[PDB]
């Protein structure tokens, strides 16, 4: 009856259960109350709204379809490896990921003019958007740390927290920064400098974020998780502390990617993990350059903020499927993350037939082959340093 | 730890498990194989299709979104009370129901011209569709049994099979046929006769379908379900019989709606069941009359064929939630069925402001009140006949 253990491990990694429930009204379902709310809200909107403007009806209908799909997600979609701060938030994150996957599926069938029209419908200002370090100055160097460098620091902090490896994080950091420098040489869009991508991105933002993530990860590993109930706390300070720590992990998994005597499927799964990581880093660059929008546009940072949100559970589910011998099935969030990464790659290839010439396409392919080979060399070096030191 | 029993009963009525699996390759998941298939098919379509015609791109993208949402349904959506012939078919039925619910949500925000344009886009021929029994003849009476009378017979057979009650079925049959006769008097659209709805619909089609459904239900109750494996059958005839009986119920539930000493929530839940039944019968009539399409159009019989498909699990889940004391949550298919019924009612009210005048609206409201009162009287009479005879 090992199939019992297999399906229970799949439910452990796919729909985690809330343990030691003390305040029971956060976890008792009220789906008939939700049905009445749904029907009454849709009734109020149907019978009171003004449906005279035909382009507002479409926008409101889209927003309402998204909202009630999130409701359906809360009701029916899987929860993931996380139960904190509430499993319903992760059900809604999964529903958003499914919506994005279906949006990419639909996008793969239009032509470029239809996609540009679909974009100008969202932000009409996107119609007019278009695509020196010899005078070195400390002021201009320090002026590089904008809000996006802050976001990049924190994204690398989250990545290092989840991955728990200096080697993988630094490998991906250096390889992607060099790839981006190469692409900015191939495309005249570059404006900042060499030194930015060489020092102020690898060493300071990415490196510091990785350091912070690894420190916080070691802290969360070495600590004891004794959760008292909010009802049992008698001080107000303890109540506020418990309510704010409800937004932190209840427990922490010990993550080791390479064992001393590792198999071949293990190293191959780690290599595929690093390759999909590089691919998701390429998707951002190429979506930004194909459909011309800036980094400050809600498309850019919205997609970048959603990809990290769905990256958090995906790493845990991938690590479980890779290492846990009894997890005989891939989590559904990891499945959707993989399909979203590959569909974004296909979208960039389909509508990206204008970016490069044939010689530039040759150079891009040769560089991507060299990057895959260098990633493999770094992975082998990590395996060797592990199984010897 | 009664919450364990509560959630296990919810999983019994919401995601039923396949028992005694002998041919294991119909039930082992292959979601990475499905991921590779998804990506390769979408890649082949993206890189080979002709995206020159802009109105074919939208149609193909819609169809592909539906297909891959059905894939996501197979992966993530609940199964229902049924595991026969395969739980994935019922996951896909649930996904279609979710799609229809979201379509109604979207429809509630457009105006009437936008809905008519959305319809003429589907079937351009819908632009030109527009809204004697004193010479009695046996030939004209027998000529009434078209393919739709056949479908109605079989729909009532399925309803009687699931409900397991002559009283409820005959009550709904007579009340709805009288309501439809009243509405066809209020609307000059009538063409057939009095005698059709009085004799050839209540007595022959509905009555005969109910009789057949009750006979088949008693048969399925009194029989023993010994399922041998397809591998263990040694004759070819037995193999074909097992393969064709894989499309029949594996077991049958004994259904009794009224106990001798029933509560008030029990009778109230049965009354609500009958009222939602009447409402779903009204939705068909009014969708057909608001948006003018014939009964032979794929909209009419397609929606009528999908509503029965999702009616099959909904009745079982409603009966479980009503009668089973440990089923502390409503099944998700029953939830979606209820929201679809009420949303179709809201859609008919929103776009149906043209069908009736104010006096006709008064007559419709008075008739619906009388119908609710007569349904309650019939339910009380059934309760009395049960608790006395
Ligand atoms: C503060 C929160 C108030 C209460 C929250 C309670 C809750 O969060 O419960 C979630 C349940 C299902 O999850 P849950 O029962 O835990 O697990 C299910 C699992 O059994 C399935 O097998 C699996 O497939 C999975 O998808 C799950 O559906 O949904 C609901 O009731 C939400 C309606 C609340 C709305 C109340 C009024 C709103 C309008 C006014
Ligand atoms: C003849 C059929 C071949 C094999 C069928 C196997 C199967 O039907 O399995 C279904 C599983 C998940 O169900 P299942 O594991 O039974 O139950 C899950 C439950 O554990 C969850 O908790 C719950 O949330 C629920 O939604 C379920 O997802 O999906 C799949 O693998 C389908 C991919 C097959 C495609 C194979 C190649 C296609 C391209 C070529
Ligand atoms: C909607 C989402 C908003 C936050 C969700 C949320 O507050 O979780 C609700 C929590 C309930 O904690 P508990 O019953 O003591 O145990 C939970 C389980 N043992 C755990 O530690 O995971 O509630 C709390 O303990 C803290 C209440 C803060 C509510 C802030 C909103
Ligand atoms: C635009 C759309 C974007 C939508 C995306 C939003 C999702 C944001 C997610 C990013 C948070 C990154 C935090 C890193 C992280 O992994 O912690 C996530 C924690 C998970 O708690 P857990 O159940 O105890 O996990 C135990 C498991 N064994 C483990 O090892 O970890 O759970 C947490 O503590 C995270 C709390 C974040 C606060 C969310 C508030 C939202 C309310 C509205
Ligand atoms: C895709 C859906 C197509 C039909 C699904 C289907 O054929 O079910 C697969 C069945 C497998 O039966 P089993 O392993 O003996 O036991 C099942 C369980 N014990 C039950 O009786 O429910 O397979 C069979 O037993 C009959 C095979 C016919 C396949 C026709 C297609
Ligand atoms: C346009 C879109 C429309 C899509 C809708 C399609 C759904 C059709 C459903 C209507 C079938 C009505 C049959 C009546 C019925 O209820 O039997 C349904 C059976 C269920 O089997 P089970 O798991 O053993 O149920 C045991 C449970 N305890 C019970 O008492 O019943 O399961 C069955 O036996 C039904 C088999 C029907 C054949 C389906 C083939 C589809 C393949 C493609
Ligand atoms: C033109 C340019 C040219 C460029 C050329 C480039 C060429 C480079 C090409 C490289 C191709 C390399 C192929 C190697 C494949 C071998 C894999 C393997 O066997 O390991 C297996 C698992 O492997 C898996 O887990 C697969 C699951 C993945 C599906 C989800 C995707 C989501 C990813 C999310 C990533 C998120 C990252 C985001 C981080 C921010 C190991 O497991 P097992 O031992 O087999 O046993 C099964 C598991 N149990 C039983 C133990 C439980
Ligand atoms: C203008 C014209 C005017 C007209 C006026 C008209 C006015 C008429 C208005 C009539 C309104 C009557 C209201 C009566 C409500 C009382 C209900 C009650 O208490 O019973 C309760 C359940 O009740 C429920 O189950 C509710 C769940 C329903 C939600 C899903 C909808 C899907 C329906 C699918 C129908 C499919 C049919 C399709 C068939 C083909 C009983 O249960 P409980 O004892 O409370 O305990 C809970 C359950 N446990 C604990 C035992 C497990
Ligand atoms: C190309 C790989 C196709 C081979 C395949 O998937 O069969 C699988 C390879 O299984 C493996 O050994 C892992 C390697 C697959 C990782 C590649 C996914 C990326 C797809 C992007 C390609 C774009 C170009 C065979 O295993 P499975 O049983 O079919 O799947 C396991 C499913 N459960 C059991 C986990 C549910
Ligand atoms: C109006 C009824 C609203 C009252 C309500 O739903 O609270 C519920 C009435 O619960 C009942 O007693 C059943 C009666 C409700 C049937 C009406 C549904 C049709 C909605 C169409 C209205 C259109 C006009 C209270 O119970 P609940 O805990 O909130 O829900 C139970 C949820 N689980 C436990 C089953 C998951
Ligand atoms: C939810 C958790 C997800 C957090 C991941 C953040 C992603 C990091 C990121 O990509 O940075 C930027 C993302 O932008 C943001 O998310 C801004 C939000 C700042 C605070 C975020 C956390 C608090 C993208 O800008 P860029 O042009 O790519 O510049 C990067 C190097 N020049
Ligand atoms: C899947 C199982 C669902 C089967 C339910 C069928 C619904 C029955 C029905 O409504 O009949 C008709 C449905 O049409 C059909 O489904 C035709 C299919 C015939 C065979 C169906 C079963 C085999 C609707 O026509 P109408 O104009 O409403 O006439 C009715 C009285 N004049
Ligand atoms: Ca950079
Ligand atoms: Ca009729």
From Swiss-Prot, chains A, B:
Compartment annotation: Endoplasmic reticulum membrane
Family: Belongs to the phosphatidyl serine synthase family.
Effect recorded for residue 249 to S: In LMHD; does not affect protein levels; increases the rate of phosphatidylserine synthesis; profoundly impairs negative feedback enzyme regulation by phosphatidylserine
Listed name of the protein: Phosphatidylserine synthase 1
Origin species: Homo sapiens
Reported regulation of activity: Requires calcium ions. Inhibited by exogenous phosphatidylserine.
Transmembrane intervals: 25-45, 62-82, 92-112, 167-187, 197-217, 267-287, 300-322, 336-356, 364-384
Membrane topology (UniProt): Multi-pass membrane protein
Gene Ontology biological process terms, A to Z: phosphatidylserine biosynthetic process
Enzyme class, UniProt record, top EC level: transferase
Activity vs pH: Optimum pH for both PC and PE is between 7.0 and 7.5.
Catalytic function, reaction form: a 1,2-diacyl-sn-glycero-3-phosphoethanolamine + L-serine = a 1,2-diacyl-sn-glycero-3-phospho-L-serine + ethanolamine; a 1,2-diacyl-sn-glycero-3-phosphocholine + L-serine = a 1,2-diacyl-sn-glycero-3-phospho-L-serine + choline
Record topological domains on the Cytoplasmic side: 1-24, 83-91, 188-196, 288-299, 357-363
Keywords associated with the record: Acetylation, Disease variant, Dwarfism, Endoplasmic reticulum, Intellectual disability, Lipid biosynthesis, Lipid metabolism, Membrane, Phospholipid biosynthesis, Phospholipid metabolism, Phosphoprotein, Transferase, Transmembrane, Transmembrane helix
